[PDB]
């Protein structure tokens, strides 16, 4: 119906801004950058569309896309932040990609990691925000993390309220860094067998999908 993007974001423990890039632009927040690598590395690779029309001068998005208009959002929105999407699909090796055919219907993807301070094998997922938050053992502000708690529940509360949920359209984009040491050097999940947990997971931030009519 109408265009669409990443409205807003939090992670800060308290939302943040991020200033739509029209008329004026935001500066001088607390650049933390930690979360948002974090973040980025997910937002990043857990998606499933692409661009249609790549343009020149022209906002990246033109209504032109291929693929879930929840999953889209960030890739714009980082591929103009130089953040190499198309790119990362091909650095790390895609272990495994489960579709929306798990239980609780999520949809997730493991990769190793070739050569950056997480651990080598990677999870990243989404589903509704809650259900991220269910599965939350921590959440990570500061570049840090903190025990979560219901304080810490509470100001993911309000935003995600803020944010004006109605059902699941807004994403909750959490990793947990799959342990090399406890780990296999094989690293034979697959989709069958996986065996893997599905509820270490930190907070890290979140964006505001929106999935209008």
């Given amino acids: 119906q109408n265009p669409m993007t990443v409205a807003h974001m939090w992670f800060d423990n308290q939302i943040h801004e991020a200033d739509t890039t ?17 973040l980025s590395r997910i937002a990043g690779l857990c998606n499933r569309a692409v661009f249609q029309a790549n343009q020149e001068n022209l906002p990246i998005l033109k209504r032109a896309v291929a ?24 650095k790390y090796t895609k272990i ?5 055919n798990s239980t609780n219907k999520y949809q997730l993807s493991i990769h190793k990691n070739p050569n950056a301070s997480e651990p080598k094998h990677l999870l990243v997922m989404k ?20 025990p979560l708690d219901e304080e810490l529940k509470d100001a993911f509360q309000n935003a995600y309220l803020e944010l004006g949920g109605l ?47």
């Fill in 67 to 90: 693929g879930d208009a929840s999953e889209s959002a960030l890739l714009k929105c980082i591929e103009v932040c130089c953040g190499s999407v198309m790119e990362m699909r091909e």
């Fill in 96 to 100: 495994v990609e489960i579709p929306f």
């Fill in 22 to 38: 029209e008329n004026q632009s935001g500066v001088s927040f607390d650049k933390t950058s930690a979360t948002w690598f974090a």
């Fill in 167 to 213: 059902g699941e359209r807004v994403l909750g984009f959490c990793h947990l860094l799959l342990p090399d040491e406890q780990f296999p050097e094989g690293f034979q999940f697959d989709t069958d067998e996986v065996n893997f947990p599905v509820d270490n997971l930190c907070f890290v931030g979140l964006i505001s999908m929106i999935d209008p009519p």
């Fill in 127 to 146: 589903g509704a925000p809650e259900r991220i938050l269910d599965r939350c053992s921590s959440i990570l502000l500061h570049g840090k993390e903190q």
